[PDB]
Design a binder for these strands. Structure first.
Ligand code: MG
Lengths: 43, 89, 274
RNA sequence: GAGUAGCGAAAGACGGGUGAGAAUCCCGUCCACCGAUUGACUAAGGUUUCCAGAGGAAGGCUCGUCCGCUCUGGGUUAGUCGGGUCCUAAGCUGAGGCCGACAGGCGUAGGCGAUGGAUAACAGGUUGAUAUUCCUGUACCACCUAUAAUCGUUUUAAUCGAUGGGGGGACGCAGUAGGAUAGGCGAAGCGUGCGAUUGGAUUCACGUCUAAGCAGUAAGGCUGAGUAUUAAAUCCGGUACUCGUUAAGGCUGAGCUGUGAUGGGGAGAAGACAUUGUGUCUUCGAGUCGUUGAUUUCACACUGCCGAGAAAAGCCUCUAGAUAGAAAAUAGGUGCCCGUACCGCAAACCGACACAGGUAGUCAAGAUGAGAAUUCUAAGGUGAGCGAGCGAACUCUCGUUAAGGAACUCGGCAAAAUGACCCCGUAACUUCGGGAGAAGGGGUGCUCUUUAGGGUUAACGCCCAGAAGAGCCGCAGUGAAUAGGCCCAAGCGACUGUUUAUCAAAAACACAGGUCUCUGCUAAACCGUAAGGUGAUGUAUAGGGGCUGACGCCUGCCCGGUG
RNA sequence: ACCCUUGGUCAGGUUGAAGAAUGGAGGACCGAACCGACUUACGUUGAAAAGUGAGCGGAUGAACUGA
């Protein structure tokens, strides 16, 4: 059966990805929290 | 410049077979173009190159012990000079 | 005229279509055609605002001059054509010295008749002239509301208003509905009724033929759930259990007059209808 | 719980070898499975799983000397392929601007963005791994330099041209035709075999070649485009004459070739040596005829239809301007970044797994047929990561059953039976379309005689079909596989369609058709606080909402109450 | 789920509308690919957190599918 997450590099990097989070202030937030947390993969 | 881009030569059974012909193989920097490699080699060895071909190799996974790593990204150029002979002694 | 299909299939029993005899050229012009990308009820946000609108056959827009502004220069009708955007047809016209543009096809425009826009133009089916020079009693189409903006009133297959009189700077006009409005005299009309008078007699037949003009099914309100519509709910089929039939968004729908009061057009409507 | 359940669709057997160890690894023979695919490509996705050595702890539902596992070392080569480079759609952004408690939302000019448009390389060889990328052969597209065979006020030219104008690109659905073309299938050439089971000796394979460059062109489209005339144009957007609708063929379109390149790379090759332990190297080798032929290509061509079927750039002319210059008949050079391994109906992807699910597109042979159905097979892959016994109960899947035939059962659930093609027949009822394959009957094998037919034709010959007789054989002749059970009568819904992904597919929803009502256009209705939109670039034969729901006959009475 | 832009797919046969032959209409018919989930049986610590087998419905359209 068709399950979820039919992977796609372009959409993955479009809906997510550094420049997309840097396009909205709320996007800028999640990077802020992820650095405060010391995350290694930020977007 | 013209010496900083040729990192090392490449010696291996396939490179050796190419050297049976006038094709020589080098490990060049990752931010250069064919023309610059032509110029650099014909500047150093005083050779006259006819053509050159470039390829980019992706970083390969290498696990050392318990720590995983990746090897460095590589850019390899193949020259096919006409007259001349890059000697790798 | 109307062609009645023979009942060869059930889904095609009572079907009827337009014979398309009046159409003389079956192809458009590359220079008076611009793109129309269907929007399907969606707005600047992307949300369905009007419903029952969706997929349909592509269509090219045929830009026409409702503002018949080339004055004095005569024009020949080259071909009466089919237009998908409108109930009526359109007619290519070539002006006496080279330019060509589309108009709306009157009732009896035949390829070869000349058309003159202006103010010293005759009273002939097709010629456009201001309402100060249109005799009392004439059938008029494409009636402009503001001087110069272009035709806005009476433009659909079989639309005709009658110039009924003259006040001062306004002429009295009985629009298709029944309203006797007052339109400024410096505004233009076009003599005659708009063609495809049999557009209203066609039968669609197929569900799919209605689902080719861009219509989508409309769900009778009395079967949605209480959270979807005011007529919804009930165990079984139910009557309208409210004092009045209602609308999806909670507003009376069988009688409530929804015309904004205090409008700047109220001083211009002598009698109303519809 | 227990040494219990499970070991994840399937055909293996045996000889040889390897090792401490072998049903399980390597080689060989035989056998079997797929073959509109388990075959070949190519996308998306995964990233090194790719290749050669080596290892055996762990992972492989068993074992393991093996591997998609581990260790070591390797492997992806482009001016022409796909992108960047060129263009733009839907959308997304958006300087100034509009609106906004802040945050910010919207939006113009302009940009970004292919799933589309435009763009110059073909064949063969080649390793363990790459190849329209490397090499051999032959090309083509841009760009630059030298030279030019005289183009010639450098305004015009050999000819340079916008960011502007126009043309072009440039497009739907469905039918048939038609010409050759890849295929496939029979016989001339070529090849190598002529048999140890009775017999026979006109008794299996091959059968070729590109882009480019011209020479030709097969359906196929258009001429008045005719001189002169109306921030501008004297090629085009609108006018008026002679030869006039010639096809002379003027024009623009566009799966096509004899003597040459063709006594040449490849020449399905047995022929050839010291060997490339004989596994190899020279160098030597046929391409013919005539049948069928596309779902491919002309080509959205033509014809018909209504549902009326992208944009921009490349490109072409034309001006505005710009300028003493190179075109011409050559000869030399220069052409960058990214992707390229590997899997891709799959043990490398989405499903936690070496999962019986899902995963767009291209090619797709023979016999039988109408067929991409069905059974067997070719090219090519594969034998399914547990087995050896015994053939108890009981479940599962499958076949057959005496006599009876729904007596079972809530219900003929399941199973059984009809099925193909040809001929003959077919009722009520009908909205005249249908009902209808209605129902219901009969035949189909094989050999011979005979002899119509039309298709390619110069004819032989090759195809594809007919009719009438005379036999022959079986229990059975569409001898296997594949291919409707039917009829009478009631509700319900007109119908095709859509619905509770994962217990309900229906009488529920849609529907075409009716009716009522609102709405005059900054329309009503709707999304937003607003700006901006949708409606609509629509205009009462239009748009929103309510109700009912093909079609036919009709739709009574009540306005007290509420709206 | 719906929609916007741009692409792709639908072997083969039948019937014979409008305009005796001709013509090629249809949410027309039979039927593969494809899509669906009607009945049943199996499965129910599954091969599978919805499938498989056998039948079954659409199959040029209100079709199906890709980006
Ligand atoms: Mg699919």
């Amino acid at each position: 059966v068709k399950r979820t997450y039919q992977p796609n590099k372009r959409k993955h990097s479009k809906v997510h990805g550094f420049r997309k989070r840097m396009s909205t202030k709320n996007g800028r937030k999640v990077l802020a929290r992820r650095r405060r947390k010391g995350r290694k993969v930020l977007s | 410049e013209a010496r900083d881009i040729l990192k090392r030569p490449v010696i291996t059974e396939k490179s050796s077979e190419a050297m049976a012909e006038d094709k020589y193989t080098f490990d060049v920097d990752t931010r250069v173009n064919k023309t610059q490699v032509k110029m650099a080699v014909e500047e150093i060895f005083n050779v006259k190159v006819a053509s050159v071909n470039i390829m980019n190799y992706k970083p390969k996974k290498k696990r050392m012990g318990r720590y995983q790593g990746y090897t460095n990204k590589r850019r390899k150029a193949i020259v096919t000079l006409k007259e001349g002979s890059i000697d790798l002694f | 005229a109307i062609k009645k299909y023979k009942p060869i299939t059930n889904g095609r029993r009572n079907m009827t279509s337009l014979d398309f005899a009046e159409i003389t050229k079956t192809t458009p012009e590359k220079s008076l055609l611009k793109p129309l990308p269907k929007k399907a009820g969606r707005n600047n946000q992307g949300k369905l605002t009007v419903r029952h609108h969706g997929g349909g056959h592509k269509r090219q827009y045929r830009v026409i001059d409702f503002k018949r502004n080339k004055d004095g220069i005569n024009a020949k009708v080259d071909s009466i054509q089919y237009d998908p955007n409108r109930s009526a047809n359109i007619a290519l016209v070539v002006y006496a010295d080279g330019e060509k543009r589309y108009i709306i096809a009157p009732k009896g425009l035949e390829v070869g008749q000349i058309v003159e826009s202006g103010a010293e133009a005759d009273i002939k089916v097709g010629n456009a002239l201001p309402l100060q020079n249109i005799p009392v009693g004439t059938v008029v189409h494409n009636i402009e509301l503001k001087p110069g903006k272009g035709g806005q009133i009476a433009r659909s297959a079989g639309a005709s208003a009658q110039v009924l009189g003259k006040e001062g700077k306004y002429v009295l006009i009985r629009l298709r509905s029944g309203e006797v409005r007052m339109i400024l005299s410096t505004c233009r009309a076009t003599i005659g009724q708009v063609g495809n008078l049999q557009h209203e007699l066609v039968n669609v037949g197929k569900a799919g033929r209605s689902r080719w003009k861009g219509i989508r099914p409309t769900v009778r309100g009395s079967v949605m759930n209480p959270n979807d519509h005011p007529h919804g709910g009930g165990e079984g089929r139910a009557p309208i259990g409210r004092p009045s039939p209602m609308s999806p968004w909670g507003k009376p729908t069988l009688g409530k007059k929804t015309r904004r009061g205090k409008k700047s057009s109220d001083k211009l409507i002598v009698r109303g209808r519809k």
